[PDB]
């Protein structure tokens, strides 16, 4: 559990997803991760992994606050230059048993 490492998610919607750790807070309360969302944004409810885009989402509604390349929405969804930077919970992420392949090196 150190920055610039490769970790995988176990529970929640992020089943068997490979991610990368960029920075760790000195308080070790929460950790920042590079990941791809699997939510529908409240339209399919009464999905595969694909890169996030910041323009098709701004029309459905909600509290959206854009200040250029920086966006905030739906409970502080930290975003910059079209990429999500929200933090993860340590129990849901597993550090060992990842062993990343070259394809991961091209995603982030």
Q: State in angstroms the smallest separation of the CB of 58 from another protein.
A: 9
Q: State in angstroms the smallest separation of the CB of 34 from another protein.
A: 19
Q: State in angstroms the smallest separation of the CB of 76 from another protein.
A: 22
Binding site for another protein (CB under 8 A): 1-2, 26, 28, 43-47, 55-56, 59-60, 69, 81-82, 99
Q: For another protein, give the closer residue by CB, 1 or 105.
A: 1
Collapsing DSSP states into helix, strand and coil, what is residue 42?
coil
Residues 6+ apart with CB under 8 A from 49: 17, 36, 38
Residues 6+ apart with CB under 8 A from 86: 33, 35, 76, 77, 78
CA dihedral 30, 31, 34, 39 (to 10 degrees): -20
Q: For another protein, give the closer residue by CB, 12 or 82.
A: 82
Residue labelled with tokens 């000195």: 26
Q: State in angstroms the smallest separation of the CB of 88 from another protein.
A: 17
């Amino acid at each position: 559990l150190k920055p610039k490492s490769w970790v995988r998610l176990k529970r929640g919607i992020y089943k068997d997803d490979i991610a990368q750790v960029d920075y760790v807070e000195p308080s070790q309360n929460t950790i920042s991760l590079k990941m791809i969302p699997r939510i529908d944004y409240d339209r399919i409810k009464a999905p595969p992994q694909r890169l996030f885009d910041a323009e098709k989402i701004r029309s459905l509604g909600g509290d959206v606050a854009s200040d250029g390349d920086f966006l905030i929405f739906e409970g502080n969804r930290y975003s910059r230059k079209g990429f999500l930077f929200k933090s993860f919970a340590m129990s849901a992420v597993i550090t060992e048993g990842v062993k990343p392949t070259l394809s991961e090196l091209e995603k982030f």
